[PDB]
Amino acid sequence: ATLFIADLHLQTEEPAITAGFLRFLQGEARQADALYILGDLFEAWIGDDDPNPLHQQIASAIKAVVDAGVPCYFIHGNRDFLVGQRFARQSGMILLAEEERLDLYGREVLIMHGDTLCTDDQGYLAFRAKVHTPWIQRLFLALPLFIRHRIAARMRADSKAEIMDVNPQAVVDAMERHHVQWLIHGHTHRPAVHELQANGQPAWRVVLGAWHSEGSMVKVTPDDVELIHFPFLEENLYFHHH
Numbered sequence: 001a002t003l004f005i006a007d008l009h010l011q012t013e014e015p016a017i018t019a020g021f022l023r024f025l026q027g028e029a030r031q032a033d034a035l036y037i038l039g040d041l042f043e044a045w046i047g048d049d050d051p052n053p054l055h056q057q058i059a060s061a062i063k064a065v066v067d068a069g070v071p072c073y074f075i076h077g078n079r080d081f082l083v084g085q086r087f088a089r090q091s092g093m094i095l096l097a098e099e100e101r102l103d104l105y106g107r108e109v110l111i112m113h114g115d116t117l118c119t120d121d122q123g124y125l126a127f128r129a130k131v132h133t134p135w136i137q138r139l140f141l142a143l144p145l146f147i148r149h150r151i152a153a154r155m156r157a158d159s160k161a162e163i164m165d166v167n168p169q170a171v172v173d174a175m176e177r178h179h180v181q182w183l184i185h186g187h188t189h190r191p192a193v194h195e196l197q198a199n200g201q202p203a204w205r206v207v208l209g210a211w212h213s214e215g216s217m218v219k220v221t222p223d224d225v226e227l228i229h230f231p232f233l234e235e236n237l238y239f240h241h242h
């Protein structure tokens with residue numbers, strides 16, 4: 001089985017999500033054929049030279065899965081688009097492009113984070129165009145770490161002062177550009193299975209859920225596609241009247 005997760009938004013202020021991800025990496029991920037992380041693994045990223053200890057804890061936990069024989073892949077999200085090759089080497093993950101076509105047990109599946117499908121939020125897509133410009137990234141990464149920390153903290157507070165869903169035609173355009181009947185993405189935080197038509201045949205868009213109160217993953221087997229929700233920590237059972 002191949003596993004897909006996204007929108008974990010890991011941060012030191014949310015240790016329960018971190019503990020759930022570590023339990024997921026030590027358990028379910030070890031039995032998988034592969035693990036794909038489709039963006040927004042971290043709530044924020046200002047560069048691989050960030051000494052945030054959470055980054056090294058996550059990197060060593062993913063590396064343990066990679067050392068256990070499970071290849072791990074990463075597609076950038078809107079929050080952690082600055083994740084680079086330094087963290088990829090520390091974690092053993094392979095960085096993929098914003099759109100990838102996979103062969104999962106015979107069926108061709110398109111994977112992406114999903115923010116590029118939300119073409120109705122032109123305010124966001126302008127922001128995305130800027131921060132994805134290579135010379136803007138090189139200039140930001142050259143700034144000192146404490147400057148980058150203060151830039152990110154101010155932009156988060158300013159953005160805090162409602163995620164737009166995908167555009168239906170953008171979905172059709174992507175699945176026809178890649179000639180696929182299956183699409184998996186996250187970003188929108190609306191876990192669902194949508195039926196549509198692409199390339200003159202029925203197609204399906206599978207959406208991952210954010211790790212808010214419980215975990216979320218998509219499991220693709222040769223026999224089916226599964227959207228699975230599970231608790232973060234081990235919910236130890238313990239023991240009404242007639």
Ligand SMILES: CC(=O)N1CCc2cc(S(=O)(=O)N3CCN(c4cc(Cl)cc(C(F)(F)F)c4)CC3)ccc21
Pocket residue numbers: 043044045046078079080082124127130131132136137138140151152153155156159
């Ligand atoms: C809609 C959306 O996605 N948002 C909204 C707010 C937000 C903050 C983060 S962040 O905290 O992780 N961080 C990432 C790197 N950022 C950056 C990068 C570059 Cl290349 C140039 C610049 C420059 F503009 F300062 F030059 C700033 C600083 C902020 C991530 C995503 C988002």
Ligand SMILES: [Mn+2]
Pocket residue numbers: 006007008009040187188189210
């Ligand atoms: Mn997200």
Ligand SMILES: [Mn+2]
Pocket residue numbers: 039040077078079113115186187188
């Ligand atoms: Mn996102």
